[PDB]
Amino acid sequence: PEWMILEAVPVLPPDLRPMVQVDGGRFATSDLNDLYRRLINRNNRLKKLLAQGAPEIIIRNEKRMLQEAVDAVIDNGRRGSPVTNPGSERPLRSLTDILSGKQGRFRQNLLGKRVDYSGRSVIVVGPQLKLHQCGLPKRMALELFKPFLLKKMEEKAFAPNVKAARRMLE
């Protein structure tokens, strides 16, 4: 029943994202962190705000902060913790509506993945050889096959080392 808690455990990688320009805006930051903070600050202010003898009342009212502060990284499901505080707005991405939730990360990277030689195009039709046959535009195509493309170009004329290859597709 180690469900009682004494050591939340947040990672750090996902956040340290930095400056995005073009069109009309730049500046850059992340969430879960500023969301995380909530914690440590409290759990830090507690200790140094007790050691200096903070009798009753105070003590609990604080400490508990951690508690509430914990229902942070976890699930924002009660009164909310909007950013822009006071801020009457958005919901802190606390594994709710996002990450683990539905259609945010889980419902996303389970199937909502991505090919890498994918692509798209319009639509046509018209007698060819029908079946097994397909439109596909010279260029457009190419890339999809760019890899081997080089390869065949190897031993068989075209070019020498694949080194170049793309060097010719410029």
Binding site: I5, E7, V9, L12, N43, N44, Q67, D71
Partner: protein
């Protein structure tokens, strides 16, 4: 080897520290009013405090390191997290809490 049955479930606080391994606590300066990166407390690169001049001891071999100031052959330049997991320790020792204990009356309520 080759994957199979996928286990999971708890990992008592005793465990926290296991993965936690170390690293954490302290403050979380989301950068300095100056040189953006680091802070020597938060997303601080594990054992990276301006010029710790250490930590590279844990690593057996592979390549050189220890460049005094700035940064050595650490992760900060390459292999930094490598999208891998990195656990934080949290200093958390204060009273209690609750991993949400969900919304079905378990890990309490019933017991």
């Amino acid at each position: 080897k080759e994957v199979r049955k996928v286990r999971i479930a708890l990992a008592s606080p005793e465990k926290i520290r296991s993965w936690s391994y170390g690293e954490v606590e302290k403050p979380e300066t989301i950068n300095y009013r100056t040189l953006k990166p680091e802070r020597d407390g938060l997303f601080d690169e594990r054992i990276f405090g301006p010029i710790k001049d250490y930590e590279c001891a844990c690593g057996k071999y592979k390549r050189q390191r220890f460049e005094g100031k700035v940064c050595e052959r650490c992760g900060v330049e390459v292999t930094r997290s490598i999208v891998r997991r990195y656990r934080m320790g949290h200093i958390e020792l204060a009273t209690p809490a609750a991993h949400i204990w969900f919304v079905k009356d378990v890990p309490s309520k019933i017991g």
